[PDB]
């Protein structure tokens, strides 16, 4: 997946699209992420 993404971005285009598919894995991946010590 996330070859298929920097694929897509290292893809010669002149403009960068919104490619929903990337803006939702961005998201789930962005949010997988005295003995208080």
């Known amino acids: 997946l996330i ?3 920097s694929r897509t971005a290292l893809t010669e285009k002149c ?3 919104e490619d929903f598919l990337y803006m939702a894995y961005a998201d ?3 949010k997988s ?5």
Do not use: G
């Not at 992420?33 to 010590?37: A, D, E, H, L, N």
């Open 3 to 5: 070859l298929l993404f």
């Open 15 to 17: 403009k960068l699209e």
């Open 28 to 30: 789930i991946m962005a």
């Open 33 to 37: 992420c005295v003995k208080s010590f």
